Write a protein that holds these residues in place. Structure first.
Motif, PDB file in Angstrom:
ATOM      1  N   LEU A   1       0.848  -1.182   0.000  1.00 25.95           N
ATOM      2  CA  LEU A   1       0.000   0.000   0.000  1.00 25.95           C
ATOM      3  C   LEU A   1       0.894   1.246   0.000  1.00 25.95           C
ATOM      4  O   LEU A   1       0.919   2.006  -0.966  1.00 25.95           O
ATOM      5  CB  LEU A   1      -0.989  -0.077   1.179  1.00 25.95           C
ATOM      6  N   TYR A   2       1.708   1.422   1.041  1.00 29.12           N
ATOM      7  CA  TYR A   2       2.468   2.662   1.255  1.00 29.12           C
ATOM      8  C   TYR A   2       3.521   2.995   0.169  1.00 29.12           C
ATOM      9  O   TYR A   2       3.849   4.168  -0.044  1.00 29.12           O
ATOM     10  CB  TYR A   2       3.094   2.599   2.651  1.00 29.12           C
ATOM     11  N   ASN A   3       4.006   1.995  -0.574  1.00 25.69           N
ATOM     12  CA  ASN A   3       4.916   2.186  -1.710  1.00 25.69           C
ATOM     13  C   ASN A   3       4.206   2.378  -3.067  1.00 25.69           C
ATOM     14  O   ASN A   3       4.887   2.520  -4.083  1.00 25.69           O
ATOM     15  CB  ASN A   3       5.946   1.037  -1.731  1.00 25.69           C
ATOM     16  N   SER A   4       2.868   2.387  -3.126  1.00 23.93           N
ATOM     17  CA  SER A   4       2.113   2.415  -4.390  1.00 23.93           C
ATOM     18  C   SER A   4       1.377   3.740  -4.639  1.00 23.93           C
ATOM     19  O   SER A   4       0.414   4.081  -3.956  1.00 23.93           O
ATOM     20  CB  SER A   4       1.145   1.230  -4.427  1.00 23.93           C
ATOM     21  N   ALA A   5       1.756   4.449  -5.701  1.00 27.90           N
ATOM     22  CA  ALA A   5       1.093   5.666  -6.164  1.00 27.90           C
ATOM     23  C   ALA A   5      -0.256   5.415  -6.878  1.00 27.90           C
ATOM     24  O   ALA A   5      -0.913   6.354  -7.323  1.00 27.90           O
ATOM     25  CB  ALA A   5       2.079   6.438  -7.049  1.00 27.90           C
ATOM     26  N   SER A   6      -0.715   4.164  -6.967  1.00 23.72           N
ATOM     27  CA  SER A   6      -2.106   3.839  -7.316  1.00 23.72           C
ATOM     28  C   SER A   6      -3.104   4.565  -6.409  1.00 23.72           C
ATOM     29  O   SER A   6      -4.205   4.894  -6.843  1.00 23.72           O
ATOM     30  CB  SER A   6      -2.318   2.328  -7.193  1.00 23.72           C
ATOM     31  N   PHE A   7      -2.719   4.782  -5.155  1.00 26.47           N
ATOM     32  CA  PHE A   7      -3.589   5.449  -4.195  1.00 26.47           C
ATOM     33  C   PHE A   7      -3.169   6.896  -3.971  1.00 26.47           C
ATOM     34  O   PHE A   7      -2.034   7.172  -3.584  1.00 26.47           O
ATOM     35  CB  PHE A   7      -3.589   4.699  -2.860  1.00 26.47           C
ATOM     36  N   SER A   8      -4.094   7.819  -4.216  1.00 26.27           N
ATOM     37  CA  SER A   8      -3.821   9.236  -4.029  1.00 26.27           C
ATOM     38  C   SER A   8      -3.833   9.576  -2.545  1.00 26.27           C
ATOM     39  O   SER A   8      -3.314  10.612  -2.128  1.00 26.27           O
ATOM     40  CB  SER A   8      -4.852  10.085  -4.774  1.00 26.27           C
ATOM     41  N   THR A   9      -4.428   8.691  -1.749  1.00 32.93           N
ATOM     42  CA  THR A   9      -4.512   8.889  -0.311  1.00 32.93           C
ATOM     43  C   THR A   9      -4.455   7.553   0.420  1.00 32.93           C
ATOM     44  O   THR A   9      -5.028   6.557  -0.014  1.00 32.93           O
ATOM     45  CB  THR A   9      -5.837   9.578   0.060  1.00 32.93           C
ATOM     46  N   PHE A  10      -3.813   7.554   1.583  1.00 34.73           N
ATOM     47  CA  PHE A  10      -3.731   6.445   2.529  1.00 34.73           C
ATOM     48  C   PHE A  10      -3.554   7.081   3.914  1.00 34.73           C
ATOM     49  O   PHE A  10      -2.426   7.376   4.322  1.00 34.73           O
ATOM     50  CB  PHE A  10      -2.568   5.532   2.105  1.00 34.73           C
ATOM     51  N   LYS A  11      -4.669   7.441   4.565  1.00 34.94           N
ATOM     52  CA  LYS A  11      -4.709   8.422   5.669  1.00 34.94           C
ATOM     53  C   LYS A  11      -5.375   7.847   6.915  1.00 34.94           C
ATOM     54  O   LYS A  11      -6.464   7.279   6.848  1.00 34.94           O
ATOM     55  CB  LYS A  11      -5.365   9.730   5.160  1.00 34.94           C
ATOM     56  N   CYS A  12      -4.698   7.956   8.053  1.00 35.44           N
ATOM     57  CA  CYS A  12      -4.975   7.136   9.234  1.00 35.44           C
ATOM     58  C   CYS A  12      -4.940   7.970  10.518  1.00 35.44           C
ATOM     59  O   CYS A  12      -4.232   8.972  10.593  1.00 35.44           O
ATOM     60  CB  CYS A  12      -3.928   6.026   9.319  1.00 35.44           C
ATOM     61  N   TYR A  13      -5.680   7.550  11.544  1.00 39.24           N
ATOM     62  CA  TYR A  13      -5.958   8.429  12.694  1.00 39.24           C
ATOM     63  C   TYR A  13      -5.474   7.904  14.053  1.00 39.24           C
ATOM     64  O   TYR A  13      -5.280   8.691  14.983  1.00 39.24           O
ATOM     65  CB  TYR A  13      -7.455   8.731  12.706  1.00 39.24           C
ATOM     66  N   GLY A  14      -5.271   6.591  14.179  1.00 36.74           N
ATOM     67  CA  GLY A  14      -4.793   5.939  15.398  1.00 36.74           C
ATOM     68  C   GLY A  14      -3.375   5.377  15.292  1.00 36.74           C
ATOM     69  O   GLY A  14      -2.790   5.045  16.322  1.00 36.74           O
ATOM     70  N   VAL A  15      -2.806   5.257  14.083  1.00 32.49           N
ATOM     71  CA  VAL A  15      -1.448   4.717  13.853  1.00 32.49           C
ATOM     72  C   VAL A  15      -0.751   5.434  12.695  1.00 32.49           C
ATOM     73  O   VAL A  15      -1.410   5.952  11.795  1.00 32.49           O
ATOM     74  CB  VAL A  15      -1.427   3.193  13.613  1.00 32.49           C
ATOM     75  N   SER A  16       0.578   5.434  12.680  1.00 30.79           N
ATOM     76  CA  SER A  16       1.362   5.929  11.545  1.00 30.79           C
ATOM     77  C   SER A  16       1.505   4.828  10.475  1.00 30.79           C
ATOM     78  O   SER A  16       1.606   3.650  10.828  1.00 30.79           O
ATOM     79  CB  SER A  16       2.737   6.397  12.027  1.00 30.79           C
ATOM     80  N   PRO A  17       1.560   5.144   9.167  1.00 32.34           N
ATOM     81  CA  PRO A  17       1.462   4.123   8.127  1.00 32.34           C
ATOM     82  C   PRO A  17       2.608   3.120   8.185  1.00 32.34           C
ATOM     83  O   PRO A  17       2.394   1.912   8.134  1.00 32.34           O
ATOM     84  CB  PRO A  17       1.420   4.894   6.809  1.00 32.34           C
ATOM     85  N   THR A  18       3.825   3.603   8.390  1.00 35.40           N
ATOM     86  CA  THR A  18       5.021   2.761   8.453  1.00 35.40           C
ATOM     87  C   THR A  18       5.042   1.852   9.688  1.00 35.40           C
ATOM     88  O   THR A  18       5.651   0.780   9.654  1.00 35.40           O
ATOM     89  CB  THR A  18       6.276   3.634   8.406  1.00 35.40           C
TER      90      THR A  18
END
Ligand SMILES: CC(=O)N[C@@H]1[C@@H](O)[C@H](O)[C@@H](CO)O[C@H]1O
Lengths: 48, 48, 145
Positions: B26-43
């Motif tokens: 997910l986090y390495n793919s520019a297919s997604f314009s957004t990957f946005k989270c509120y309780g944890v950091s993506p990495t």
């Protein structure tokens, strides 16, 4: 007001910028609890 | 990477269990314009 | 848009335009049933001041960015209540006992010492606590000891 009271649960889920906003609450709660506890104990240390 | 997705009037909930995840895909793919989270950091998701 | 938009409108998809109030989180409503928009009640399939609760998507690739469709996912999850049935891909180590260790179990990172425990866990428990509210036991996720 932090995401959790286990501080390892901040340091396992958040990075520095947002972990700060959580950890700083935990510092605030705990430090106040110690300023409370040591003052209560000081007042008792005179009762003794 | 499936074809079809639901409508917002009748959004599909699916359950994930008894398996291992990976969020670098997910986090390495520019297919997604957004990957946005509120309780944890993506990495952090990789270790959680 | 380069997948889902249809030259005349992909009307197959619907959203809700009306409800009695607002909803509770994670409530899915599959009613077709007409909403009442004036002092009159309704009967039959439709009526004057009765409004159909859904509206159909008219995605056309001629529309602007924003008015276009955008596919959405909501990956939702919870933490440390229960024996974690999902986890990210990181690799184990061999086990070590009775030396000061930077341990982890399912993301419970900490510094500690790990010792063979005669505490009578039933088949169900993953962890143990004490009278000072401190987490003092765990069952290894690979060997049930
Ligand atoms: C056949 C194909 O292109 N599959 C893609 C893959 O290449 C990509 O790495 C992945 C990331 O979401 O999504 C899917």
């Amino acid at each position: 007001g932090a995401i959790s009271s286990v501080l390892n649960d901040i340091l396992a889920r958040l990075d520095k910028v947002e972990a700060e906003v959580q950890i700083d609450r935990l510092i605030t709660g705990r430090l106040q609890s110690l300023q409370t506890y040591v003052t209560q104990q000081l007042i008792r240390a005179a009762e003794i | 990477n499936a074809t079809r997705f639901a409508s917002v009037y009748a959004w599909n909930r699916k359950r994930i269990s008894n398996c291992v995840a990976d969020y670098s895909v997910l986090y390495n793919s520019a297919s997604f314009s957004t990957f946005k989270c509120y309780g944890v950091s993506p990495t952090k998701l990789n270790d959680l | 848009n380069n997948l889902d938009s249809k030259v005349g409108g992909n009307y197959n998809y619907l959203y809700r335009l009306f409800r009695k109030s607002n909803l509770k989180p994670f409530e899915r409503d599959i009613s077709t049933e007409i909403y009442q928009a004036g002092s009159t009640p309704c009967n039959g399939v439709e009526g004057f001041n009765c409004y159909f609760p859904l509206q159909s998507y008219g995605f056309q690739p001629t529309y602007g960015v924003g008015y276009q469709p955008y596919r959405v996912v909501v990956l939702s999850f919870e933490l440390l209540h229960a024996p974690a049935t999902v986890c990210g891909p990181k690799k184990s180590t061999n086990l070590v006992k009775n030396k000061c260790v930077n341990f982890n179990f399912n993301g419970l990172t900490g510094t500690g010492v790990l010792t063979e425990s005669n505490k009578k866990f039933l088949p169900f428990q993953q962890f143990g606590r004490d009278i000072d509210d401190t987490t003092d036991a765990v069952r290894d996720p690979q060997t049930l000891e």
